[PDB]
Each structure stands twice: as structure tokens, then as C-alpha cells.
Symmetry: D2
Amino acid sequence: TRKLILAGNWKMHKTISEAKKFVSLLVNELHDVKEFEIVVCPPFTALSEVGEILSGRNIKLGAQNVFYEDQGAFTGEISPLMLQEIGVEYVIVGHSERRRIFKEDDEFINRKVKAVLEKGMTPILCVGETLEEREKGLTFCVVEKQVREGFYGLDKEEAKRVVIAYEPVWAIGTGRVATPQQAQEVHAFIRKLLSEMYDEETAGSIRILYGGSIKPDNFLGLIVQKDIDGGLVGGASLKESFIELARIMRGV
Amino acid sequence: ITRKLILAGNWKMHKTISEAKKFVSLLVNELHDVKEFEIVVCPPFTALSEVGEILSGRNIKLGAQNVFYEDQGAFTGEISPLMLQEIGVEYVIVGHSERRRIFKEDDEFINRKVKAVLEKGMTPILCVGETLEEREKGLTFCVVEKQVREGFYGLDKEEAKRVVIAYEPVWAIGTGRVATPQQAQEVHAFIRKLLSEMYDEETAGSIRILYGGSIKPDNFLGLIVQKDIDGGLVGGASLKESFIELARIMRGVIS
Amino acid sequence: ITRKLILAGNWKMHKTISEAKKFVSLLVNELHDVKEFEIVVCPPFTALSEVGEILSGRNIKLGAQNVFYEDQGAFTGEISPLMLQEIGVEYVIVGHSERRRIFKEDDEFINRKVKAVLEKGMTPILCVGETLEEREKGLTFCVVEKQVREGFYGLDKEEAKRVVIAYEPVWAIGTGRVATPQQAQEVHAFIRKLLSEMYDEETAGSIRILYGGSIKPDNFLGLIVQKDIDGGLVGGASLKESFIELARIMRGVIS
Amino acid sequence: TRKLILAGNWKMHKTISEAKKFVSLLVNELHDVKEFEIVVCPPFTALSEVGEILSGRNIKLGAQNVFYEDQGAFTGEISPLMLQEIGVEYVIVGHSERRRIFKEDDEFINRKVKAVLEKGMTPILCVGETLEEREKGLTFCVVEKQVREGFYGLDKEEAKRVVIAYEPVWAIGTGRVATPQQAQEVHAFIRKLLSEMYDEETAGSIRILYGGSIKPDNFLGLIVQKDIDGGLVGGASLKESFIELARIMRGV
């Protein structure tokens, strides 16, 4: 908790032309932000161009993925350095799409968490169970494994910097949001677990946001819950609905 | 038969928008009269837009190191063909060893990227190559054939001509162990006979097959001379000015 | 609550029909009055029929080291539940580490074998256990829970009682590094609380949970004494006569 | 070529009770065999019992799989020793079912070929393309890879002992047999390749049998072809149809 976050993950969606316009629209409508942070994550291609429009502004730059090496022969990948030089503050790691479609495993993910922290950036670690896992009663152990694997090797001080995002796979793009009751139950669990790995202090420092079918007509009720520190917006982050959400987010 | 030679530079994960903007301008002027073939630079996504304008109207061409096969969608961290087409990218490396080995990218996955790149009017550069163990078992030809057949599957005579293949023996990637022009040529000749049966003589003669072991400024002359080697997919050397050297060498084989 | 202790021997890939016939007869007489618990021998498929007759009517019970979940079909090299049931097999080890690690046998695959074994009126012995790395990340409990939940999935109160679990910490398999009775007991207690939530008190108390690290004739006494350890899944020691020793020890904990 | 083989792969099909009867039926109807070999492959459970009924008889004992170690901690597996002691002469390795359902890779397979030869038994190496592979034009390279991987590390003398069985996956149990023309084309190819790896001598020594939907009303026409040295019978090997096949096999 302590400083909510409204993060938008555009995913594979905008052209440098569109980004420039859209970002500006946001920066105009939200130049005034009541401390709760607002992050926008455009694709690699449009990062530098968006960097400008944001430089010096309140809204912060976010990236969708990163490799764990400063440089090397890894054709197609982007290094932490390249993201830093552009002024990217947040980096999404472990997104369900990457885990599932691109077969990224926990170790791979864990090695990325550190790399993002090394260059003093904030990693957004994604966790979440699949419907099948939820039905077998593995919701918690699945989240627990991912979290433990994610933080493995981090000290109380680094762990404090990490951001967690619970995107229940059964609710990504399916339009089926988890009730605030279901969201909170897992968020709470993550918080308790977080403290058992460290201490009540770190656990309260780490921000855990909800992700998965975050629409304007359901965001209130999710941010209201005790342990949900904001959201990782998917679709809604592409339109102007990202403003109505940021608006609601100001209701606290 | 004629075929336009090609010299491509795969920077890989190496430069920042600054280092990039510099190096690129340098070249835009060094290789200014060079119009007898194509020099392609492939910077990281982060730095394409910048380099993109340093080339708008110049001779050197823009190329990406990877692409996803869809136009847009729920695919965090991926770049679409439309995103590359806006910036003015003309070439896209597809199926590179690193992606196949390290990022478990399979043939069917790669085949879709090939068709995808072609749909937007861009040029795929399909990479194929054996492993040391593979070559030791005599599987060089079947490893290459499988990859060529898979990659081209579904394409037709027309689309096939637009593809560019790049033979990159894995046992010669960054290990320094470049391939003797004999070895290179042998394989390139095969890939061309194969391409012949798959489609026809005309087609197999239109498709450029570049080499990719450890192309250095010294040995490169002993390769481009070969019969079935139409250019090179350069790694390291594409970083330094030695790239501008290679570009020189290649010019002394055309008229 | 009562629960009948169980001592099982997983010969693994070790004896021939001859060595087998010998060892078995030896036992049939040594452990002759032993009827306060169950001794189970698990020879390789090749040698089941032989050992099978050396037990027909005796006290010691027959057990297999693996099974496929179908009754018959196009599955070269596999053994069916019917094939085991004819010979008179009563126990079937399912989900052993070696099979999970070496032969890529997954949870869903193992769950089907559990149901299958139960259908023919036989007893599954589901093996669960963490890895050194897993225990170092504090994943012991979730690794075990996942495996227990997966394995039992679909079963009900009745069928669940018939299952026999065997906690076999992988970092203690053939490495000699047996587990302190503290560690063993801790986990066994968890697996039993879990089994309690999954079904109920009655059920969790009926299910035997055996230990399986490096059960030797000396340390075995410090384990069977524990509260939640109902017996042992013995590897090596099940080969020699030391097995007959362990069987002795276990007898001195019943009345 | 040189000494055809009629091999029956029961797969997962008989009880020790049934085996004893059935085998006997065969041993009675075929105690007289015009040199062409007849192998029967029952499941592990029934091996020793069938061993007796066959001991001293013409029909030979075959197994469906084996591990590559004489002994060790490999719960559920059977060693070469265990097969030998029972008098098993042939061992099927690399059967499509094992490759596909049980994920056995070429190395695994190759390590089994040697192990079977060590204890002086004859391994039956299975190879074959899937429909999809056949359509992409990979029929040959697929067979070539499997064969090369299978023989890797074998000398002219061991390689001579190896038996090859081409079971086109698209024809296993599908009831769709390959025409003799299609069968021969691949068999021929394997023979040419076999010689290029060794010499015309070894290539002619190695026996290559067809496998896949071998029924009595199509066996003749397959054994007739030049490079098909017999068959690996699946279903047909379970009934008495295994006798009509053995009967036809005698027509040469």
C-alpha cells in the first residue's frame, strides 16, 4: 500500500503516430494528479517518441518487457539500458501472455526482476491462476510459487521496490472480472505471504494491484477494497476510458 | 539471372538511441554513392524511429530483428508488422538461431512470421543453420531442408521470390569459427537446388542466399566470390566501422 | 482412528526371475507370523508371475512399480491394470520421482493412473516430494499440496480413503541424506491437515502416509514412531535381508 | 534383405492366461517354418510364461521396450538383463507410440539400440513420418534423421545386426495402409542411405520391414516388393490372422 498506481498496458496496439496524439490527450486531461501514480506502457517502437511528450510531466513511462542482460547476442530483445536511457520507470515482467504464449518460466522471470531493479527501475511482477488451477484449489499455491520464485534472492530493501500485479488468467480479456471479494481474498493472501517472507513493514510497502477486465463500471469497488492498490489496465487503457478510470481513482 | 547482392547488419542487443543516431549518420555519408546493392541496418526496436529519420530518403535501408505475426492484440511485449511498416522498415530478420534456441521459437511460429512480413510488403530474412552435433551426424542437409521447407510452406512462386534466406551455421556464431568458403558454398548450393525442386529454376535463381558465420572484414572476400553466396548477414562487424569496410569489399565484385 | 502400518519395498530395476524367486521364498518363511501389518514387495514386471505364485496364500503382498491407465490398446511397452490384476497384484506405486523426473510423467497423467488402479480394486501409492531447490525456496508445502490435490482430484470420500500416500523428499533419494524425523513428521502432518480440508477428519485419518527418504534399518525406528508416519516406501533396503530387519522393527511398535 | 521377418507386436493386449493358449496355437500351426523368421512380442508380464512354450521351438520371443541400463533406480523400467535371462531375442525400440505418447527422443532411443546389441539381442528400430510431415515434403529427411540418430556410433559390424521397421505414423491403426509403391519408395530410400553411411554390404544385410495396417488381404504385394523384408504386425498379430499372414509369407 502507500501510493496507488493506475497502470495501462497497451499491449500490441499503437503506431507512433497514434501514440503521440493519445498520450498528449492524457497528459492534457491529467496534468493534475492527486499523488496516485499514472503509468502508461507503449510498445518498444513508440517509447522514445512518447518519452518526450512525457519528459517533465506527471504521467510516467512504462515498458512491456525486457531482457536480463545489458547487452549481447540476443537478436530481437531489448536491454535494461535501452529502456533506462529513454526514461522508462516501470517494466512489466511475467505477464500471463509472456508466460503462456512465449513460454517464459519463473527463473527467466526472476532474473528479469533483478535486472530491472539494478538500473533502479520498478518491476511489475504478474501472477495469477488459470481457471483449471482455480477449480482444483490451487489458486494460492500457484500465486505463492510465482511470488516466491519472483522475489527469490531479493533483500528486504529491494523487495520493497517491487510491484505485484494479480491478473487472474481466467479474467484476462475474457471480460469476466473477479468480484472485489475474490480479488481482495487473493490480494490479502499475497500480503500475508509477503510479510512471512520478510516482515510486516515490507509487506505494507509493496503495492499489489488488480489486473483483468478493469472497466470503468467496476473499477470502483476494486480500488475500494483494503489490499488492492490500483490496477493494471488492459483494453480500457487504449481508449479515453483510461481517463474515467483515473478520475474514479481520484475518489480516494 | 542477376540477383542483387545484400549486406545486412544485425546489431542484436547493442545500441542506444544516441550511439545509434551517430553511427547511422556516419554511414549515410560514407556509403553515399553505393547504389549497386543493398546495405541494411537492423537496430533494436527502441531505436528504430530515430534511425528511421536519419535514413528517410538515403540509400541505406531499415531492418528489424524480429516481429510477431499478428497486426495487434493481447500480446504483451510484442511488435506488429504495422508498427514496423509505419517507421519504414523494409527488412525483418526471422528465425534467428538465438530466437530458435534461447526463446523456443519453432518452425510453424516462424512460418507465420514469414507470411506476415510478406503481407505488409516487407522482406523476410529466414535464418537456417545446423548445430555442431547436427553436422557431426551428417544432418546438415536435412536440418537445413526441414527449416527451408517449413519456412516456405504455404508460399507460392511469387511470394517465394521475395524471401531472402541466410545460412548461419550455429557452430560459427560468435565462436569465431567461421566457415571455409567450401562449406558455405556447398550448403548454399544445396539450398538452391532444393528451392529449385520446391518451385522452379527461375525462382531458385531469384532468391538471395546470404552467409552468416563470423563474417569478418578479411575473410568476407573469400565468401562473396563463391557462386551461391549473394551477401552476408553480419553480426559484430555491423557494429564498428569495419561494417563500412565490408561494404567496400562487396563493391569490388560488381560492375 | 487405527490405521494399519505398511512396509513396502520398491526393488526398482534390480532382480531377475531367479534372484527374485529366491529372496521371496526366504521371506515367505521369515515373516510368517507377521499379520499385524502389511509387507509389500514390488518386483519388476518381468518377474511378477513367478513371485506371484510364491505368495499365493501367504501373508506378504504383491505390488507393481507402475501401470498405464487404460485396459488395453495401442500402447507399445505398457502394462494394463487387468494384466496386473490377473497375477494378483494388490499395490501399485504411482507417481514415483524417477518417473516424474526422468520419464516426464505429469500430474494429470498420474491422476488417471490413480483412478485406474482404484477401478480394479487395487491400492495406489501416490508419491509426492520436493526438490532441494524447492525446499530452499520454501516451496515444500505448495509442491506437496499441488501433487496431492492433483492426484486426488476427482476422487471422493470413499475412494480417497483407499489411497496411500508416500512422502519421498527427492533430495533424500539414494543420496543417503535421509530426513530427520522432525522434517518427515512436519510434512506428513501437513499432508494430513490438507487431506482434512479436502475431505474430512474421518478420511484424513484413514489414509496411510508413508515416508520414503533413505529408510535404513537403523534410522527407521526414529520415523515409524512419529505421529503422522504410517510406514515406509523402501528402496535399496528392500533388496537385501535388511528388509526383513525393518519388518522386525515395525513389529515392535504394535500390540 | 536375407531372411525375412514376420514380427507381431501385441502392444497392450494379453493376460498370461490368454497368451499361453494363443502362443501354443501358433507354435502348433507353425512348428514348420521355411526359414523366414517368426517373432512374437507379448507384454512384460507374460514374457517368462511364453518363454517356456517357446523354448526350443522355432518361433522366437520378442519384447516391446527396454531401458538402457543393466540396473539402477528407475522405478517401473525393465533392464536388458531381465529380457535376456528370459531368452528374448528381439526388442522393439522407437515405436511411434513411445516417441509420441511417452516422449522418447532420438538420443534416448539411440542409447537403447546399443544396450540391446550389448547383450547380443536384435533391436527393431522404428521410423516413420506423420501425415503433416509427409505433406510438407519431409518424409525422407524425417526417416533420415531417425535412422542416422539411431545408428550413430555403431560400426559396420553392429549396424549389420540392427533391424529397421518403417511404420508411417499416418498408417498406424488408422487402417490406411501405404500402397506397396509408397512403401517400397521409402524402404529403397532407407537402403540407399544405409549404404551411404556404411557400404553396399551392410545395407544389404540390414533387414527393413513394413509396419502399419498389415492385414491378410494386403500383405501380399508388400512382401513382394524388392526392399520390404517382412512386416511388423500390429492388430493382425493378436488374432489367428497372424497365421494366414505367416502362410502368405511362405509364398516366397
